[PDB]
Design goal:
monomer, alpha+beta, Ubiquitin C-terminal Hydrolase UCH-l3, six-stranded antiparallel sheet, 8 helices, globular, thiol protease, Peptidase_C12_UCH, Peptidase_C12_UCH_sf
């Protein structure tokens, strides 16, 4: 029904066709696989990385750690929203999280994307449109988005999984999880490579507690 979507699988080919359907007419970015979090595997990732996407199963331990990070970080997260503004939305619909993650990656990298087709989902009211609840509502309600998501999900088709997005913001590796109140702050970083290291370190901490990792890179 309207308020439960089919799950989108972590699959770069499916994701790349999807972002085309969302309105990227000639995408200058693409998703690729990240094969793991060792230095060896990270070296294989193209550079620069604009965003790291992760699908993972929640464990109570991981959820615990996140609660403590949220509680430790309220002040610094508020400061960062002002100092280095970024796009964050809540996820109001179950299983919308692959789309939220892709939205997070794209909308925090508009300068990289290429042309957005006039009239496309990415040109839509939510995309133009502050508060994560309000944006979240509009995304949850966009029937064009829901329909495109369904089609992408089906293309990939043949334990509480969550899909999230890591971006660099003001010298910090930031996790955008639409199922959390606030962005989560992880390691510090100074350049793009150290951001990838910081995202990988956050991921590796949960691996020890399977995972699908992708990266948004230039095409």
């Amino acid at each position: 029904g309207p308020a439960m979507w089919f799950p989108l699988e972590s699959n770069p080919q499916v994701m790349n066709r999807y972002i085309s359907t969302l309105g990227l007419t000639e995408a200058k970015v693409q998703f690729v696989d990240v094969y793991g979090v060792s230095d060896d595997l990270l070296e294989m990732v193209p550079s620069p990385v604009h965003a790291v996407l992760l699908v993972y199963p929640m464990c109570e331990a991981t959820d615990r750690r996140l609660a403590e990070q949220q509680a430790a970080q309220t002040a610094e997260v508020a400061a960062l929203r002002k100092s280095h503004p970024f796009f964050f939305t809540h996820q109001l619909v179950p299983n919308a999280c692959g789309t939220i993650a892709i939205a997070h990656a794209l909308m925090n990298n508009r300068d990289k994307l290429g042309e957005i087709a006039a009239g496309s989902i990415l040109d839509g009211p939510w995309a133009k449109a502050e508060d994560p609840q309000i944006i979240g509502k509009l995304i949850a309600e966009d029937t064009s988005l829901a329909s495109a998501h369904a089609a992408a999900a089906q293309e990939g088709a043949t334990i509480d999984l969550h899909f999230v997005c890591f971006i660099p913001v003001g010298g910090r590796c930031v996790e955008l999880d639409g199922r959390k109140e606030n962005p989560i702050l992880h390691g510090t970083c100074t350049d793009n490579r150290s951001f990838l290291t910081a995202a990988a370190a956050a991921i590796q901490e949960r691996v020890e507690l399977e995972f699908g990792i992708t990266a948004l890179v230039n095409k």
